[PDB]
Design an enzyme around this catalytic site. Structure first.
Site, PDB file in Angstrom:
ATOM      1  N   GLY A 121       0.659  -1.264  -0.185  1.00 13.81           N
ATOM      2  CA  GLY A 121       0.028   0.011  -0.093  1.00 13.81           C
ATOM      3  C   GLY A 121       0.885   1.267   0.061  1.00 13.81           C
ATOM      4  N   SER A 122       0.264   2.305  -0.431  1.00 18.58           N
ATOM      5  CA  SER A 122       0.987   3.502  -0.690  1.00 18.58           C
ATOM      6  C   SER A 122       0.075   4.808  -0.500  1.00 18.58           C
ATOM      7  CB  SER A 122       1.654   3.516  -1.975  1.00 18.58           C
ATOM      8  OG  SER A 122       2.980   4.008  -2.317  1.00 18.58           O
ATOM      9  N   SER A 155       0.927   9.450  -0.290  1.00 22.45           N
ATOM     10  CA  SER A 155       2.148  10.475  -0.530  1.00 22.45           C
ATOM     11  C   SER A 155       3.199  10.372   0.260  1.00 22.45           C
ATOM     12  CB  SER A 155       1.340  11.871  -0.744  1.00 22.45           C
ATOM     13  OG  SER A 155       0.082  11.854  -0.940  1.00 22.45           O
ATOM     14  N   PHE A 156       3.164   9.950   1.318  1.00 21.97           N
ATOM     15  CA  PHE A 156       4.421  10.211   2.473  1.00 21.97           C
ATOM     16  C   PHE A 156       5.083   8.699   2.783  1.00 21.97           C
ATOM     17  CE2 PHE A 156       1.216  13.528   3.302  1.00 21.97           C
ATOM     18  CZ  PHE A 156       2.236  14.744   2.751  1.00 21.97           C
ATOM     19  N   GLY A 157       4.284   7.653   2.613  1.00 22.09           N
ATOM     20  CA  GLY A 157       4.864   6.365   3.093  1.00 22.09           C
ATOM     21  C   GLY A 157       4.237   5.256   2.375  1.00 22.09           C
ATOM     22  N   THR A 158       4.773   4.016   2.729  1.00 21.08           N
ATOM     23  CA  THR A 158       4.701   3.026   1.948  1.00 21.08           C
ATOM     24  C   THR A 158       4.563   1.583   2.882  1.00 21.08           C
ATOM     25  OG1 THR A 158       5.933   3.930   0.071  1.00 21.08           O
ATOM     26  CG2 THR A 158       5.090   1.699   0.024  1.00 21.08           C
ATOM     27  N   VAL A 159       3.700   0.695   2.808  1.00 18.36           N
ATOM     28  CA  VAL A 159       3.779  -0.646   3.481  1.00 18.36           C
ATOM     29  C   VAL A 159       4.060  -1.691   2.538  1.00 18.36           C
ATOM     30  CG1 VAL A 159       2.141  -2.095   4.841  1.00 18.36           C
ATOM     31  CG2 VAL A 159       2.144   0.243   5.118  1.00 18.36           C
ATOM     32  N   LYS A 198       6.161  -0.015   7.640  1.00 19.83           N
ATOM     33  CA  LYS A 198       5.875   0.988   7.411  1.00 19.83           C
ATOM     34  C   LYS A 198       6.837   2.013   6.953  1.00 19.83           C
ATOM     35  CE  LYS A 198       2.385   3.309   9.302  1.00 19.83           C
ATOM     36  NZ  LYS A 198       1.750   4.403  10.062  1.00 19.83           N
ATOM     37  N   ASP A 233      -9.180   7.092  15.022  1.00 18.43           N
ATOM     38  CA  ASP A 233      -9.654   6.495  13.985  1.00 18.43           C
ATOM     39  C   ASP A 233     -10.150   5.156  13.884  1.00 18.43           C
ATOM     40  OD1 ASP A 233     -10.579   7.364  11.459  1.00 18.43           O
ATOM     41  OD2 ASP A 233      -8.376   7.139  10.531  1.00 18.43           O
TER      42      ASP A 233
HETATM   43  C1  LIG Z   1       3.136  -1.515   9.192  1.00 14.81           C
HETATM   44  C2  LIG Z   1       2.519  -0.739   9.937  1.00 14.81           C
HETATM   45  C3  LIG Z   1       3.010  -0.119  11.131  1.00 14.81           C
HETATM   46  C4  LIG Z   1       2.455   0.619  12.021  1.00 14.81           C
HETATM   47  F1  LIG Z   1       2.999   1.211  12.653  1.00 14.81           F
HETATM   48  C5  LIG Z   1       1.119   0.735  11.647  1.00 14.81           C
HETATM   49  N1  LIG Z   1       0.407   1.577  12.603  1.00 14.81           N
HETATM   50  C6  LIG Z   1      -0.554   1.292  13.454  1.00 14.81           C
HETATM   51  O1  LIG Z   1      -1.129   0.402  13.284  1.00 14.81           O
HETATM   52  N2  LIG Z   1      -0.810   2.238  14.272  1.00 14.81           N
HETATM   53  C7  LIG Z   1      -2.117   2.236  15.434  1.00 14.81           C
HETATM   54  C8  LIG Z   1      -1.069   1.947  16.903  1.00 14.81           C
HETATM   55  C9  LIG Z   1      -2.603   1.875  17.920  1.00 14.81           C
HETATM   56  C10 LIG Z   1      -3.794   0.754  17.358  1.00 14.81           C
HETATM   57  C11 LIG Z   1      -2.201   1.759  19.048  1.00 14.81           C
HETATM   58  C12 LIG Z   1      -3.256   3.274  17.861  1.00 14.81           C
HETATM   59  C13 LIG Z   1       0.377   0.087  11.034  1.00 14.81           C
HETATM   60  C14 LIG Z   1       1.158  -0.714   9.648  1.00 14.81           C
HETATM   61  N3  LIG Z   1       0.457  -1.085   8.980  1.00 14.81           N
HETATM   62  C15 LIG Z   1       0.093  -2.665   8.771  1.00 14.81           C
HETATM   63  C16 LIG Z   1       0.652  -3.693   9.631  1.00 14.81           C
HETATM   64  C17 LIG Z   1       0.340  -5.109   9.491  1.00 14.81           C
HETATM   65  C18 LIG Z   1      -0.171  -5.410   8.430  1.00 14.81           C
HETATM   66  N4  LIG Z   1      -0.287  -6.769   7.900  1.00 14.81           N
HETATM   67  C19 LIG Z   1      -0.958  -7.127   6.743  1.00 14.81           C
HETATM   68  N5  LIG Z   1      -1.213  -6.146   5.827  1.00 14.81           N
HETATM   69  C20 LIG Z   1      -1.864  -6.779   4.720  1.00 14.81           C
HETATM   70  C21 LIG Z   1      -1.158  -4.992   6.084  1.00 14.81           C
HETATM   71  O2  LIG Z   1      -1.562  -4.435   5.362  1.00 14.81           O
HETATM   72  C22 LIG Z   1      -0.725  -4.404   7.099  1.00 14.81           C
HETATM   73  C23 LIG Z   1      -0.518  -3.101   7.652  1.00 14.81           C
HETATM   74  F2  LIG Z   1      -0.892  -2.236   6.928  1.00 14.81           F
END
Ligand SMILES: Cc1cc(F)c(NC(=O)NCCC(C)(C)C)cc1Nc1ccc2ncn(C)c(=O)c2c1F
Ligand SMILES: Cc1cc(F)c(NC(=O)NCCC(C)(C)C)cc1Nc1ccc2ncn(C)c(=O)c2c1F
Ligand SMILES: Cc1cc(F)c(NC(=O)NCCC(C)(C)C)cc1Nc1ccc2ncn(C)c(=O)c2c1F
Ligand SMILES: Cc1cc(F)c(NC(=O)NCCC(C)(C)C)cc1Nc1ccc2ncn(C)c(=O)c2c1F
Ligand SMILES: [Cl-]
Ligand SMILES: [Cl-]
EC number: 2.7.11.1
Lengths: 262, 264, 271, 267
Positions: free
Chosen positions: C16-17, C19-23, C35, C128
């Site tokens: 996923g993508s 403007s600022f970051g990419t997973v 991320k 959120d």
């Molecule tokens: C990498 C990453 C790092 C992060 F730091 C956050 N941040 C975050 O959740 N903050 C909320 C914290 C709190 C709830 C306490 C408020 C999200 C993500 N994303 C993420 C993680 C795992 C994933 N596994 C599978 N798949 C298909 C995904 O797409 C996927 C994904 F997109």
């Protein structure tokens, strides 16, 4: 995937420069147009604007919208579209002795409403509809796009003649401001001139359109302009933006009055 | 005239890591910085942007404004300024364990008020004042300029600088003297708290929406305990959500200069 | 310390993508998600958000919270978590033919209540919560996270940048007046909307296409979810709890200790 | 009837003034000329229209007190060529110069201005920006009415005619704010400049306050500042031109005849 590898596009004649990049004619499985950046390392801001514009163009498939064909990232960010043959509606109406029959003017209005209705159904706001951004491809097919190009002083002025009061004031841009701009295009088609031609001072135009009740003089529409078309134009030009019609009604109205002519 | 003949400027190492950077260290009667449009042929709009910036820079002569020195056209469009020694204020505050004395923090605020007061007297709006655009030259003189500067000079997207944008700028004459005063107010907040505002709101879109609707503003309880009362008052003045309730820089400058005298 | 030295993570498929970051999916002693900031020199707010997010995730240890695993500095800022297997609750309920039995719908509500109850006990406001941030890991474990990636607005496009969160915003957050309206209570309301999706199978206001009408009317109080749409076998305790969580006056909503105890008790009652 | 000047005939000389889009030069074409040249890259539809409409209005004017249009050019750039006026504008003479005007001269300045505005209106032309900066005292004996303004657009990085603007022009609430009557009002402010030597509201400069109060009628020019040797019929005429209610303003045929008749009485 719409990326075109480097080495396939043969860039040819330079057409002009806009706010994004420079437009050229090119060769890629036929004729294309290429809008490309000057820099080999774009800033994050340039790359975001590029992805935004490829992003919106990739969402359009309609005979009356400039046909997106692909994009390049190396050596430079570049957007590739079909090559449009002929001239903009502006050059036809205001910078040539092209005389259009009223049937053709209606047809141009109808095709422009089709493209605009399509863009709005995709929740795309064009933001700068005007006869310069309407290309008459092959002298038979409207293509809506962004065709503004500079082929000493810098151009500082916007498209003030097509700006709704709430836009010329200053989220001013909306579906309803596109409808107003379409109303000024109808004025161009049906009178053959631009609005406010007796007011040389642009500040006075800005002041009177945005604050007062300056609006185009509809007594200048040609005598053979259908009454329904004259009435539709006035609706598009309403000062209060929520009194303007939406493009489904605009299209339905233009298609129906055109059939009355046949 | 300020045009520098071809082959006088020696260009050196690009400043920064991103290959999109435009600033270089160079040599021209000593050290200089060079901002270069690296393209083989500039567009008209690039030509105009280059002339717009040189046009503004050549109207400034003040110790707290980056010193414009000249420009060149061949082989590329290049703006030449003095070379600044040291770091931006952002780096001292947020990217290094530089700790300032309150006296030094007041002096930085005072010098930034002098440069901003001078700019407004010349009817120049900065439009992007922030601790990144305040250079601590030789660790004694504030220079106000563009020090990120990949963005701005087209006569005529919210991709950065949102923490210094006034409510009315986020909303969308959005840029004004008064929005420059707001950004200066946030700079004071940085000087007096050591931190950026809204440190608990990760989502940049909620900051944008809340700040523009007047429902979010800097937590002024975070100003450090020895920050002078008059300096806290002034800060809240500069941060007023209604732009017309914000003081002008003549007043801002006078109040800082006077509260500073009460502490040396 | 949770910093992961450079070159230890094998970044794999982009997922996923914005403007600022990419997973990305990655490898680091097994599967991880990564991320990663797009730029090597981030804006002052991006860098601040990175530190605050690492600092908040660092304080969570709960089976229904996405497991923070570490963070990187070189070449770019990255946050590393477990890799979740499957789909979000939103994809299941609204973009798929998955049919959940009511017991499973209760269980998803229970696990989500556990994770939000835990967050609020750590003084963490989610801000959120919505079905897109509830991951159904391995099809049996809720993982609350925040999976959104911010996008800059295009020229060709109100609350536009928040449009994906509007159905879950409490009236005071929609109003967004004077002071920050995000709170434990607005989190609760967003849980009420999740209960509505679970128990009705649909998003609220399906009958209303006008997005501006929704915003105005919700914020004023002349529009709230149609609770007659809940399924026939939705337990009475759950429909009553939902309505409590959806109260217009934020001070009238219950807290999660009582939410979780209500769901856990009512779940026991159905065998 | 072709007034197009082939390219290469005009010799463009010293630059006189600039705006955001155009530039005025002193030039040479069968003697001295002034050349207003569109210098903007990619001129807008409205700029091209204004060039064409200005040539079309100027081409309808032949009067000793209207700036003399001589021709226009299309290559290499759009330009409008007029006679070269010698001297300074009325504004520079009254407000930025040590010029002392005999009251006889001041009446005669107002008389010629009335002649040209009467001519313009008789040809159905609304000037729309009459002010002392647009009244040129050619060879210090012949009023040339023109419009010497060049449009300017405030820059993004930087933070006029209002003193002569009729109250209805400020309000923008009534039909057709710009009219023959708004030109009469502006003429009234020119008369006030002439008979007092100063700009109106000189001791009230609060700016956007002045604009708002003039629009709503709670601030008007202080007529007590007219010079002692100002004829009573001139001061009552100035007060009539300055009437807040636009329909109470006299027309220029009456304005010119009143000034004409009163200038005979004092030789
Ligand atoms: C990498 C990453 C790092 C992060 F730091 C956050 N941040 C975050 O959740 N903050 C909320 C914290 C709190 C709830 C306490 C408020 C999200 C993500 N994303 C993420 C993680 C795992 C994933 N596994 C599978 N798949 C298909 C995904 O797409 C996927 C994904 F997109
Ligand atoms: C190359 C190019 C790439 C682009 F991406 C856009 N962008 C754009 O249309 N955006 C609006 C999109 C939407 C309407 C959906 C909002 C425009 C263009 N221009 C272009 C294309 C073809 C041309 N053929 C002939 N001639 C003489 C031209 O000048 C010409 C031209 F200038
Ligand atoms: C080269 C350059 C040329 C320019 F033209 C501008 N422009 C600009 O300031 N405009 C704002 C105008 C006004 C304030 C009046 C609004 C900025 C710069 N930058 C610059 C200058 C010196 C530097 N010395 C050291 N170091 C490490 C730097 O990084 C550095 C640097 F990045
Ligand atoms: C060149 C030019 C061309 C034009 F077309 C207009 N236009 C215009 O008057 N329109 C109003 C028309 C109507 C009254 C009928 C309403 C103005 C000018 N300027 C100009 C002309 C002569 C000058 N002689 C000396 N000096 C020092 C000048 O500065 C000077 C000058 F600036
Ligand atoms: Cl225009
Ligand atoms: Cl920021």
């Amino acid at each position: 995937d719409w990326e075109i590898p480097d080495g396939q596009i043969t860039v040819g004649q330079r057409i002009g420069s806009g706010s994004f990049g420079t437009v050229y004619k090119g060769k890629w499985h036929g004729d294309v147009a290429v809008k490309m950046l000057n820099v080999t390392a774009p800033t994050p801001q340039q790359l975001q604007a590029f992805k935004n514009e490829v992003g919106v163009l990739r969402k359009t498939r309609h005979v009356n919208i400039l046909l997106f064909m692909g994009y390049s990232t190396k050596p430079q960010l570049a957007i590739v579209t079909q090559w449009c043959e002929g001239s903009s509606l502006y050059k036809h109406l205001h910078a040539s002795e092209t005389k259009f029959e009223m049937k053709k003017l209606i047809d141009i209005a109808r095709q422009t409403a089709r493209g605009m209705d399509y863009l709005h159904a995709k929740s795309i706001i064009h933001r700068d509809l005007k006869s310069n951004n309407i290309f008459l491809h092959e002298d038979n097919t409207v293509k809506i796009g962004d065709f503004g190009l500079a082929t000493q002083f810098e151009q500082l002025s916007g498209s003030i003649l097509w700006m709704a009061p709430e836009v010329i004031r200053m989220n001013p841009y909306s579906f309803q401001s596109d409808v107003y701009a379409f109303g000024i295009v109808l004025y161009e088609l049906m009178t053959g001139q631009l609005p406010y031609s007796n007011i040389n001072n642009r500040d006075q135009i800005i002041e009177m359109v945005g604050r007062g009740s300056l609006s185009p003089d509809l007594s200048k529409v040609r005598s053979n302009c259908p009454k329904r078309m004259k009435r539709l134009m006035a609706e598009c030009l309403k000062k209060k933006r929520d009194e303007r019609p939406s493009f489904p009604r605009i299209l339905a109205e233009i298609e129906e009055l055109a059939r009355e002519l046949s």
